[PDB]
Design an enzyme around this catalytic site. Structure first.
Site, PDB file in Angstrom:
ATOM      1  N   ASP A 130      -2.840  -1.496   5.231  1.00 24.74           N
ATOM      2  CA  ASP A 130      -3.361  -0.825   6.422  1.00 24.74           C
ATOM      3  C   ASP A 130      -4.804  -0.401   6.163  1.00 24.74           C
ATOM      4  O   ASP A 130      -5.446  -0.852   5.210  1.00 24.74           O
ATOM      5  CB  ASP A 130      -2.544   0.413   6.776  1.00 24.74           C
ATOM      6  CG  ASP A 130      -2.585   1.448   5.680  1.00 24.74           C
ATOM      7  OD1 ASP A 130      -3.146   1.176   4.601  1.00 24.74           O
ATOM      8  OD2 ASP A 130      -2.147   2.572   5.928  1.00 24.74           O
ATOM      9  N   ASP A 139       0.867  -1.171   0.000  1.00 23.25           N
ATOM     10  CA  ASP A 139       0.000   0.000   0.000  1.00 23.25           C
ATOM     11  C   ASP A 139       0.906   1.224   0.000  1.00 23.25           C
ATOM     12  O   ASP A 139       1.835   1.305   0.809  1.00 23.25           O
ATOM     13  CB  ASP A 139      -0.927   0.018   1.212  1.00 23.25           C
ATOM     14  CG  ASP A 139      -1.871   1.208   1.200  1.00 23.25           C
ATOM     15  OD1 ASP A 139      -2.450   1.504   0.133  1.00 23.25           O
ATOM     16  OD2 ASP A 139      -2.012   1.869   2.251  1.00 23.25           O
ATOM     17  N   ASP A 176      -7.372  -2.112   2.481  1.00 25.90           N
ATOM     18  CA  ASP A 176      -6.436  -3.220   2.306  1.00 25.90           C
ATOM     19  C   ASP A 176      -6.938  -4.540   2.896  1.00 25.90           C
ATOM     20  O   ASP A 176      -6.405  -5.597   2.540  1.00 25.90           O
ATOM     21  CB  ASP A 176      -5.079  -2.859   2.915  1.00 25.90           C
ATOM     22  CG  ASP A 176      -4.266  -1.914   2.031  1.00 25.90           C
ATOM     23  OD1 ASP A 176      -4.201  -2.128   0.801  1.00 25.90           O
ATOM     24  OD2 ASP A 176      -3.687  -0.949   2.575  1.00 25.90           O
TER      25      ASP A 176
HETATM   26  F1  ALF Z   1      -2.058   3.771   0.420  1.00 29.90           F
HETATM   27 AL1  ALF Z   1      -3.525   2.751   0.613  1.00 29.90          AL
HETATM   28  F2  ALF Z   1      -5.001   1.743   0.797  1.00 29.90           F
HETATM   29  F3  ALF Z   1      -3.426   2.290  -1.124  1.00 29.90           F
HETATM   30  F4  ALF Z   1      -3.631   3.220   2.351  1.00 29.90           F
HETATM   31 MG   LIG Z   2      -2.864   2.933   3.897  1.00 27.63          MG
END
Ligand code: ALF
Ligand SMILES: [Mg+2]
Length: 879
Positions: A622, A333, A626
């Site tokens: 997170d 992420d 996710d």
């Molecule tokens: F950076 Al993300 F879900 F893609 F917290």
């Molecule tokens: Mg995140």
């Protein structure tokens, strides 16, 4: 599809009126649509937990042999089997229970309160009663209880991080959009679980509960697909071969002893040969299966969860530490995980400074006391508490953070100069500004966006107040803007606005003739230690991939810095994945690499297509978005800062935030399996020669060796201690460089097979000789002298199994202190056998001597000597 429809069309599509339901419809609406709520339907029945444990073929066969022991009258040897079956059961039943998801994280996502109009009355009711066709109002600080589109706009910005993961509020416009855009840029509608940040709005319900995207993700979490341990598939792959192997032997034992009655001389007692056959048949099934195997693997995995505990990496499920060893795909992420979710800036633009790099100084950073303070003297509205926890608009907190990073307190300058201005409200077109009064004069502070700021700003502030320069100053700040905007940096404009003097209040009309001090451009930087953990991930053979839901512009730069993707490389949008079917998905799948602006649905589908390619994958994330990718991935990691949602839906939760410990974890998993494989190679190699001695003893109608209980004793506890010792052999870190192990090779793959068969043969050779020496003297002695030579031979095997291609001498006899410690304890267990109080229940003859034992033990000794002289065959194989 509804985003396209607006105003009455959305309402006519719902055939519901805008101002008020009148409670008649909600009297009815709540019956067909149901309350806006999420409820689990997990049965979690007690029956299924245990019925499902018998699916293992290794388990059914033991059940059969235990029941046979009852009919024969060996109750002792039956109820011991049932005990280690409860072990095999309660081990496998509680590992899954921890794995199960919880809607506790889902609970409280949507605030109970929702101001809604019922019967034209402006009332606030619980989000449960909210149903499609109802109108809710959202003053700031609301939790967006129901997903939906808002016709009226208050200039308000809502936080969609819970759905998407970004910590920055996104503006909401009521204008219709006629094209398909990614779920994140659905600027005309709001979704449940998002927090409203600024303003007041009115919005349509557009369905609730499971229909909501917060409830669509709930249905996605409900699936709980995959999460099968490689070892488990590996184990069952050759458990089925084993579970069919024993049954092949049980037929021959009956056939041989039935083949011995057809040729039986004169009178033959069939009842004895049948019962004689059962004693062998039950003995083989006991000797084959490893009773301790489930209990031993469960222990070695507890060493992995302990070694990762010392690196602040928490593992909630034991078998996952082995899953780390075979990982080949890391999906991450971008914000909240690869970052600290904290923005700052290194490249400020000021005419005099002209430096790409950022220098931090204690009030000497800016030429003259005035230059640095003018960039953002009073623009920020954020606040730092005694604790220091983040609070305020995120773009603005980086300002006083910038000041604190420059070792310059913000409380010492916030009180020196005081705000006096009205602060004209901020709107979609307007930019909020403030006015302050100085020692002998006054200024107005304006902070703008460079695309709309420079259309209204003529004046420029450098080396003193300078006349507006329309030419030679727009190109160099366009060049700075564009070079910044090519590095995907968010830029904002800082103005002084000194023209007004002695004004009682602030009027919106004087937005012209602005003086601009400069421009800076901040962006989110990744962890300091990521650079080392991707260069090591690449160098470990694991293909690391990114799946985030942020803008493509920000996504292009991320990964260019770490070297994940080339500058030319372009990431794919979630809309492109919406239109791409699976047929060419896997065609594109190897080179997909970084993604951008994806929905939670998008993240979990990627891991599913990566698993179709046979490569076992891993996900790190997170927040709440996710979570589906964590639950579906073969092993899911979560951050310490991440919300309790991803924290509670991950197989590993690193509290420290130290990324490097993930690649360190892959080093543990490959070593964990290297021991387990080496260890499981040990336990079955002993099980083999024990079957060989039972079978040769059957071809000459010798009384079955080791009786019945004795066989169970050695496998359950005698061999458990050395199996754990091998489970702790040295790492051999050079092995870590090699590419991830294939999930297809057998447990004996890598040439171990040829070593397991070799050891299991030399075992039975000696056990047979002792039975011959035993059977020559007496039948009673053959049972003990065969068992003596066996349980000693399998005890001494550990020196050979330390490595399939290594010798104890020259590799360090004292190298491992637990191996030597474990061998000494098996000797005592054997000592307990020879005791007179226990000699009887161990079927050891009273007339057993020490010179006889000397012959037996000496045979067991020479067996492992043979395992050590297979060094030449192993040496010959190399060349
Ligand atoms: F950076 Al993300 F879900 F893609 F917290
Ligand atoms: Mg995140």
């Amino acid at each position: 599809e509804i985003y396209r429809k607006s105003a009455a069309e959305t309402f006519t599509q719902l055939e519901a009126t805008e101002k008020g339901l009148t409670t008649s419809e909600v009297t009815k609406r709540q019956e067909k649509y149901g309350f806006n709520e999420l409820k689990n339907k997990k049965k979690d029945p007690l029956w299924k937990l245990f019925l499902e444990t018998f699916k293992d073929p290794m388990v059914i066969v033991l059940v059969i042999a235990a029941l046979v022991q009852l009919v024969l009258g060996e109750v002792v040897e039956s109820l011991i089997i049932f005990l280690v079956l409860i072990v095999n059961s309660i081990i496998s039943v509680v590992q899954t229970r921890k794995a199960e998801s919880s809607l506790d994280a889902l609970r409280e996502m949507s605030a109970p309160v929702a101001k809604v109009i019922r019967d034209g009355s402006k009332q606030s009711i619980h989000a449960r009663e909210l149903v499609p066709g109802d109108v809710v109002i959202l003053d700031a600080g609301d939790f967006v209880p129901a997903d939906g589109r808002l016709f009226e706009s208050g200039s308000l910005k809502i936080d969609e991080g819970m759905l998407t993961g970004e910590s920055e509020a996104v503006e909401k416009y009521i204008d219709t959009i006629p094209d398909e855009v990614g779920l994140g840029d659905r600027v005309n509608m709001v979704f449940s679980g998002s927090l409203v940040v600024y303003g007041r709005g009115m919005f349509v319900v557009t369905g609730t509960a499971s229909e909501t995207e917060i409830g669509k993700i709930a249905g996605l979490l409900e699936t709980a697909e995959a999460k099968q341990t490689p070892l488990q598939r590996k184990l069952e792959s050759f458990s089925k071969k084993l579970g069919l192997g024993i049954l092949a032997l049980c037929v021959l034992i009956f056939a041989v002893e039935a083949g011995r009655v057809l040729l039986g001389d004169n009178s033959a007692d069939m009842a004895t040969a049948i019962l004689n056959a059962f004693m062998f048949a039950v003995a083989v099934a006991v000797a084959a299966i490893p009773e301790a195997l489930s209990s031993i693997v469960t222990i070695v995995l507890a060493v992995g969860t302990n070694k990762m505990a010392k690196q602040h990496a928490i593992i909630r499920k034991l078998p996952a530490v082995e899953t780390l060893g075979s990982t080949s795909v890391i999906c991450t992420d971008k914000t909240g995980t690869l970052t600290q979710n904290k923005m700052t800036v290194v490249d400020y633009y000021l005419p005099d400074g002209t430096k790409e790099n950022f220098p931090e100084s204690p009030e000497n950073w800016s030429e003259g006391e005035r230059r640095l303070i003018h960039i953002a003297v009073l623009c920020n509205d954020s606040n730092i508490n005694s604790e220091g926890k983040e609070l305020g608009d995120p773009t603005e907190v980086a300002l006083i953070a910038f000041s604190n990073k420059n070792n310059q307190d913000y409380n010492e300058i916030r009180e020196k100069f005081i705000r006096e201005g009205e602060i004209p409200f901020d709107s979609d077109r307007k930019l909020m500004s403030t006015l302050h009064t100085f020692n002998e004069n006054k200024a107005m502070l304006t902070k703008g966006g460079p695309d709309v700021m420079f259309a209204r700003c003529s004046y420029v502030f450098l080396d003193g107040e300078e006349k507006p320069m329309t030419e030679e100053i727009l190109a160099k700040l366009k060049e700075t803007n564009e070079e910044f905007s090519n590095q995907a940096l968010r830029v904002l404009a800082y103005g002084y606005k000194r023209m007004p003097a002695d004004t009682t209040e602030l009027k919106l009309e004087d937005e012209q003739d602005i003086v601009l001090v400069g421009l800076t451009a901040m962006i989110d930087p990744p962890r300091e230690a990521v650079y080392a953990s991707i260069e090591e991930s690449k160098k470990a053979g694991i293909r690391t991939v990114m799946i985030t839901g942020d803008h493509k512009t920000t996504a292009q730069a991320i990964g260019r810095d770490i070297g994940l993707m080339d500058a030319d490389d372009i990431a794919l949008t979630g809309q492109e994945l919406d239109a791409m079917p699976e047929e060419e998905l896997d065609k594109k799948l190897e080179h997909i690499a970084v993604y951008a602006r994806v929905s939670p649905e998008n993240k979990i589908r990627i891991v599913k297509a990566w698993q179709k390619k046979g490569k076992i994958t891993a996900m790190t994330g997170d927040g709440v978005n996710d979570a589906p990718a964590l639950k579906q991935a073969d092993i899911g990691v979560a951050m310490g800062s991440g919300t309790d949602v991803a924290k509670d839906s991950a197989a590993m939760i690193l509290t420290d935030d130290n990324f490097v410990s993930i690649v360190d974890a892959v080093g543990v998993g490959r070593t964990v399996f290297d021991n387990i494989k080496k260890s499981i190679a040990y336990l079955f190699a002993g099980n083999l020669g024990a079957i060989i001695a039972i079978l040769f003893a059957l071809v000459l109608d010798w009384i079955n060796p080791f009786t019945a209980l004795q066989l169970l004793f050695i496998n359950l506890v005698n061999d458990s201690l050395p199996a754990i010792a091998l489970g702790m052999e040295k790492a051999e870190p050079d092995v870590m460089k090699r590419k991830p192990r294939d999930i297809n090779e057998g447990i004996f793959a890598g040439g171990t097979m040829r070593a397991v068969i070799s050891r299991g043969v030399l075992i039975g050779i000696a056990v047979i000789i002792s039975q011959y020496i035993g059977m020559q003297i007496s039948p009673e002695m053959s049972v003990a002298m065969a068992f003596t030579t066996l349980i000693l031979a399998r005890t001494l095997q550990t020196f050979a199994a330390r490595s399939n291609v290594q010798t104890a001498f020259g590799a360090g006899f004292f190298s491992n202190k637990y191996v030597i410690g474990a061998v000494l304890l098996c000797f005592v267990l054997y000592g307990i056998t020879v005791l007179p109080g226990a000699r009887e229940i161990f079927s050891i003859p009273a007339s057993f001597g020490l010179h006889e034992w000397s012959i037996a033990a000496g045979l067991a000794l020479a067996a492992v000597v043979m395992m050590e002289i297979i060094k030449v065959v192993q040496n010959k194989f190399f060349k």
